[PDB]
DNA sequence: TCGATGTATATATCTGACACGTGCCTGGAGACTAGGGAGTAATCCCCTTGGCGGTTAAAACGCGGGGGACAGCGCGTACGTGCGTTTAAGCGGTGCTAGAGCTGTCTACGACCAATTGAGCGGCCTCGGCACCGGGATTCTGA
DNA sequence: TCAGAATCCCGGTGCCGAGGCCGCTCAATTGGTCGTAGACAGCTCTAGCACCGCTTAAACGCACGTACGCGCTGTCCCCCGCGTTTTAACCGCCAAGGGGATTACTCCCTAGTCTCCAGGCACGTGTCAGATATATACATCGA
């Protein structure tokens, strides 16, 4: 019932076959979870400070684009 | 007598399918749950008004970042001349990302 | 009073120039903005948008789509070598990835 | 009843200067709006640090020209300086 | 100026360099168009410079 | 009847030397000539003057950049479990650099 | 003479030993030359564009630092 | 002979403030001056972006709080923000 | 009139808040730069300079030298978490590379 | 505030984390000092946060 | 395992790039507008609930076999290296000169003013791509 | 090699963002002006930009030699794959209610202006650190 376990291994396999991989070890199903978790921590830790400076109890997509720009991987469309 | 296909090869059919379909690949609700976990982890347990279109923006951004690092790891493992993949390949590619993958 | 005119039409261009000069002088980059700056901006921006839309339409005509999907923009960006260098650290929402397969994964 | 601004009509016009026959999605429109805003602020930041580097409070077309020379790769700069110089010779007629 | 006709022939000397076609009322820039051009082992501008 | 010792091992002494020393590693005059060879290629042939401080700074930057990418290539080849080095290792490492060494 | 071979092979060898290499193939003596050449052609064009904007007939140590700082690999002490 | 700018007296002052016993090379002095200039311009650019994002044309300490929370990683930023709050409570008392 | 007393001494610190505010005037970051913000900048720069020079003096003590050559600076910034994360894009003039060997390289 | 004494003990529970020593007239910050901490498999701040 | 043998880790001294003195300003400290920023504020509008119920598109499990992955060994190879001439380059100094910095002094030129006007928000509406559904074309896999 | 099962066009069909489309009213835009940033002149030191000898670390080189990568069982194991069986997220949808972008207002308290004035900033000198001798534990290969 862990929230981190909500990322399912066929969806992990879905992104894997999006990346186009022949075979995968089963070990990766938590390693990708940890990588995604620390990346989400990296962007959310800045996004909450962004909306904290905005002094609102919301989180807009502009804040996420600013957080990705501060991470250095800027995003379009929003 | 029934008989079915070789391993790997019809998964490449799904690979060619997913490289043609540009949609999201993560179920929205577990991803929203797991990021609400992190904002509870940073806002001293309180929750914030998560804008719904911002959710799918972050969903697509994390998906693109993850498939990028994924194929990078598969490329380094194929440089190591083995057709499958290991977490040590992801570990090397994470290490040979620099601080771009860490901010 | 003399009849005025838009300075972009005096430049004969389609991107606005008074608007982007308002963007510059209040966008707080420097203090003094010369008159020749935003016309040079509008010129290079019109060229860049014409470039990306020309490649986008050349992508979209292959799939016979009248409207332009973000996948078309993604394929036009990552298919051209030059603008991909300009947009290396940029990603696209609902753009997907190219058809890009390693060589030796295919069998005999 | 709030007033914002964007470039979508200008994107629609420059669509007609290349493709007078095709349509456009709004997702692509937001991509384009983000794109022009990003490259505008990027080249403006480069121009500001450039003018800071030579202690000039003024910014002319020369600064933008050297900025797109240093920032844009390849023949994009070659066509961009021709576009800009042609546009300023067009505008300086009046 | 006219060196795009020369540089295109200088690039024909074989590889995948998209020449821009010609259609009226379009912008249709004279920017020479390239292969995706993998960079870690790719070619460079050695023949599109003005002497 | 003189006798020899093993190869490679004393090169590790040179590794420990060059990690302890922080000075340059490239000769001044050939590097100055090859860097003055490029303003021929960019300033329409007519060359420019320089600064010797600028020469030292570009020298240090090139040395640090090259040694960093070099050890990156060495560790990525060591991911392939071979202690020696090949240029394809550098091809992977520069390929898995992203847009950083090239803008 | 041809001056591209000025960055000689034992310089590459001692740079490798500072990088900590046990053994190295001989083919690298031109591959390092190529990657150093393209790195130089990256930085020096922007540097001379900087000096050109100063209309300066020399190259100054601040300008190359501005070029690499724009390139994204910054350097102090100059 | 007009004027040159550095922080070298302040570098030596904070050096003796932390270590009244040792010295510093001029190479390290230039390293430190360039370091603090880079850190200052980076945090000032982030502060300008931040004040741009909420249309506060002023910039006060409150932007700097979120700015150094944004740029500096973790407990480094924690000790820095406690240092800054302590200094502004010192200054606002005076 | 008044008695000679600076704002940084009124701040009681060792970094010039007036010169910093002069930079914020000239550097074109806002049109109005507030009161306490250059105080905050001089404070955090004082703290960060303390952070680098503490480990710098520690490394200089461990190599027993009067002045600090930037080898100590390079060894100090690359032996923590945050400053290495702060200065990932930064290299060091005459700082060298760390003593750093791999595990498989050691023979027996 | 005083949690640095607790967080140091929270980090003492088989790792190389340099606690800062104590000497007068020096700055000697309370900034916790770390191993170089390889990042691709490293630990994180899971126990130095205020609940 | 014990021993020669080329290191680098001590040690004495002997110059030469640095840190405090020092006039000297030129950039920093007091007084006071005024007009953007904090604060209130009610108000519509998105979003977070908890629900439905269908549902189907996904997760778990077993087999299953097949096809990679170390594994170690055989073994030609090519780079390591250290002596042996060799070279050129980083040394010293030496005009020198063209070009980087410093004032000077005008002169074109960007902010800061009234006053229209057109263009981008706001329903709106065909409406036609187009997502979607049935159906008939293609191309992997053993016998 | 080729049924046969999995996929790529092909015609139809509701449908719902969407691209003009009308209104509209808030910033561009003409005029002009006015201090003023800088363009240009010109002058003056100065740091590469060439020169000369010198001497010393590099430059093949090669002779063993040794790791090292094809390759081959091999084996085993683990993992597509695939069918079956749960199963739970997803999708309209009600509603709700409540926080949050307002605009409106309404003070208040930080940039310019001016006037003193003094701590950073270009010039000198006694150094500790690089440099040069012993010497020495000390790793590194014989058998």
Question: Domain F9-95 sits in which CATH superfamily?
Answer: Histone, subunit A (1.10.20.10)
Out of B76, B88, B97, name the one closest to residue F92 (CB).
B76
What are the residue boundaries of the structural domains of chain A, listed by start? 1-78
| Angle in degrees, CA I6, I12, I13, rounded to 5 | 95
Write the class of the CATH domain B9-100: mainly alpha
Is residue B42 exposed (0-12), middle (13-18) or buried (19+ Cβ within 10 Å)?
Answer: middle
Residue J6 lies inside a defined structural domain of this protein: yes
Residue E49 lies inside a defined structural domain of this protein: no
Bridge partners of H29, per DSSP, are: none
Residue E46 lies inside a defined structural domain of this protein: no
Q: Residue J4 contacts by C-beta under 8 Å, 6 or more apart in sequence?
A: J30, J32
| Technique that determined the structure | cryo-EM
Task: Report chain A's terminal Cα–Cα distance, integer Å.
Answer: 33
Q: Which helix (H) or strand (E) segment is D41 a member of?
A: helix D26-53
Residue J43 lies inside a defined structural domain of this protein: no
Which of these CATH numbers, 1.10.20.10, 3.20.20.150, 3.40.50.920, 3.40.50.300, describes A1-78? Answer: 1.10.20.10
Whole-angstrom distance, CA of residue E37 vs CA of residue F8:
39
**G56 SS3 class:** coil
Nearest-CA distance from D26 to chain E in Å?
Answer: 22
Q: Which of residues 21-50 of C touch strand K (CB under 7 A)?
A: 25, 31-35
C63 Cβ within 7 A of any nucleic strand L atom: no
- CATH code, H46: 1.10.20.10
Distance B21 CA to L7 C1' (A): 15
Parent domain of J3: 1-36
Whole-angstrom distance, CA of residue E8 vs CA of residue E2:
11
Whole-angstrom distance, CA of residue G37 vs CA of residue G71:
16
- Closest residue in C to H57 (Cα) is C28
User: Which structural domains are found in chain C, ordered by start?
Assistant: 1-106 (1.10.20.10)
**Which chain E residues touch C78 with a CB distance below 8 Å?**
36
Q: How far is CA F29 from CA F24, F32, G11, H94, I71, in A?
A: 13, 5, 13, 59, 25
Q: Which of residues 6-35 of H touch strand L (CB under 7 A)?
A: 6, 8-10
**Which of strand L's nucleotides are less than 7 A from any protein C-beta?**
6-8, 17-20, 26-31, 37-39, 47-49, 58-60, 65-69, 78-83, 89-91, 99-103, 110-112, 116-123, 128-130, 140-142
Whole-angstrom distance, CA of residue C99 vs CA of residue E14:
23
Q: Which of residues 35-74 of B touch strand L (CB under 7 A)?
A: 48-49
What are the residue boundaries of the structural domains of chain F, listed by start? 9-95
User: Would an 8 Å CB–CB cutoff place F23 in contact with chain E?
Assistant: no
Parent domain of D54: 1-94
Number of structural domains found in chain J: 1
**Which chain F residues touch C88 with a CB distance below 8 Å?**
98-99
**Which chain B residues touch I88 with a CB distance below 8 Å?**
98-99, 102
Resolution (A): 4.5
Whole-angstrom distance, CA of residue I77 vs CA of residue I61:
16
Out of D18, D74, D76, name the one closest to residue E27 (CB).
D18
Q: How far is CA E45 from CA B23, C47, F42, F95, G2, in A?
A: 37, 22, 12, 19, 20
**Interchain pair J31, H17: CB under 8 A:** no
**G78 SS3 class:** coil
Q: Which helix (H) or strand (E) segment is D59 a member of?
A: strand D58-59
3-state secondary structure chain A: CCCHHHCCHHHHHHHHHHHCCCCCCCCHHHHHHHHHHHHHHHHHHHHHHHHHHCCCCEECHHHHHHHHHHHCCEECCC
Is residue C99 exposed (0-12), middle (13-18) or buried (19+ Cβ within 10 Å)?
Answer: exposed
């Amino acid at each position: 019932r862990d929230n981190i376990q909500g990322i399912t291994k066929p969806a992990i396999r879905r992104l894997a076959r999006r990346g186009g991989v022949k075979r995968i070890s089963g070990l990766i199903y938590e390693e990708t979870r940890g990588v995604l978790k620390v990346f989400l921590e990296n962007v959310i830790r800045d996004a909450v400070t962004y909306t904290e400076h905005a002094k609102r109890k919301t989180v807009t997509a502009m804040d996420v684009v600013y957080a990705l720009k501060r991470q250095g991987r800027t995003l379009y469309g929003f | 007598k029934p008989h079915r296909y070789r391993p790997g090869t019809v998964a490449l059919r799904e690979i060619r399918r997913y490289q043609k379909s540009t949609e999201l690949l993560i179920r929205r609700q577990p991803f929203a749950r797991v990021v609400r976990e992190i904002c509870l982890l940073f806002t001293r347990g309180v929750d914030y008004r998560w804008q719904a279109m911002a959710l799918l923006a972050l969903q697509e951004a994390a998906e693109a970042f993850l498939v990028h690092l994924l194929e990078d790891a598969y490329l380094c493992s194929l440089h190591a001349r083995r057709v499958t993949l290991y977490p040590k390949d992801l570990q090397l590619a994470r290490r040979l990302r620099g601080l771009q993958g860490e901010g | 009073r003399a009849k005025a005119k838009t300075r972009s039409s005096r430049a004969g261009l389609q991107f606005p120039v008074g608007r982007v000069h308002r963007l510059l002088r209040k966008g707080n980059y420097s203090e003094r903005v010369g008159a020749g700056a935003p016309v040079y901006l509008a010129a290079v921006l019109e060229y860049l948008t014409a470039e990306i839309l020309e490649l986008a339409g050349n992508a979209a005509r292959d799939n016979k789509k009248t409207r332009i999907i973000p996948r078309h923009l993604q394929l036009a960006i990552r298919n051209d070598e030059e603008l991909n260098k300009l947009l290396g650290r940029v990603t696209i929402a609902q753009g997907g990835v190219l058809p890009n397969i390693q060589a030796v994964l295919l069998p005999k | 009843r709030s007033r914002k601004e964007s470039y979508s009509i200008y994107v629609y016009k420059v669509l007609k200067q290349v493709h007078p026959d095709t349509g456009i999605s709004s997702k692509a429109m937001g991509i384009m709006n983000s794109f022009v805003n990003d490259i505008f602020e990027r080249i403006a930041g480069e121009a500001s640090r450039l003018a800071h580097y030579n202690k000039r409070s003024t910014i002319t077309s020369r600064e933008i020209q050297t900025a797109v020379r240093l920032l844009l790769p390849g023949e994009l700069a070659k066509h961009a300086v021709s576009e800009g110089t042609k546009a300023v010779t067009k505008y300086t007629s009046a | 100026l006219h060196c795009q006709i020369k540089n295109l022939l200088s690039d024909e000397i074989r590889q995948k360099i998209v020449l821009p076609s010609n259609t009226p009322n379009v912008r249709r820039t004279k920017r020479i168009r390239l292969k995706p051009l993998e960079y870690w082992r790719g070619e460079r501008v050695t023949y599109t410079l003005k002497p």
